[PDB]
């Protein structure tokens, strides 16, 4: 029967791939027999096994990605798949350190001429 997304995380990659192909076979046999027999109950079984074969494909792909990101993380020029999504505008806008960095004239005067606190007496 149908199976949870939680407990498939524990299983091995090759254990899922034989599970996948066996689970996908019983989809194909039911698609043969829906022409002949048709009718109720079968049409919920074909629905569930279409949902389950996605379940196995999904958790394989996140099992890949979390492993495969760890290989390329903390390293220069990562692949395009593993970069975060973002907007076009936000990528091409330069990082706020570079915009805000101070000239050697400006930083040396900012030693004295910073935006200091003050107040008045009552």
């Amino acid at each position: 029967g149908h199976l949870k997304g939680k407990e498939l995380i524990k299983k091995t990659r090759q254990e899922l791939l034989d599970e996948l192909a066996g689970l996908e076979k019983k989809l194909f046999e039911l698609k043969g027999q829906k022409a002949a027999s048709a009718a109720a109950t079968k049409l919920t079984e074909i629905k569930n096994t279409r949902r389950d074969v996605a379940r196995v494909k999904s958790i394989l792909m996140v099992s890949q990605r979390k492993a495969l990101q760890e290989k390329y993380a903390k390293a220069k020029l990562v692949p395009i798949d593993l970069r975060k999504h973002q907007e076009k505008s936000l990528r091409n806008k330069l990082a706020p350190k570079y915009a805000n960095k101070l000239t050697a004239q400006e930083s040396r005067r900012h030693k004295c001429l910073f935006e200091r606190k003050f107040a008045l007496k009552a």
Partner: protein
Amino acid sequence: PRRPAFEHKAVKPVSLKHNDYKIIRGPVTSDKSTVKIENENTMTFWVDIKATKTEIAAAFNRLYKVKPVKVCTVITSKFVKKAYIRLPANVEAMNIATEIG
């Protein structure tokens, strides 16, 4: 010659996707196909629209373990592909059709 510094697309896909099971959709149920099974020893199937006769002949062989003689290929007025697959003389097309049902 060319050699990139990293893979661009790192993630390979999970399975074949364009599979043997998803080439051959399933058998066609008509009065014409009933005659062609019994008389000519010739099955009929709904097929993927991009599948060639070379793809069908191999994909039919992997599933049912029978190498076909010919494959002849319609595209219907419903815009799905129909494949008239002649089986060889030894196997009977009723006996393969009874397994599927």
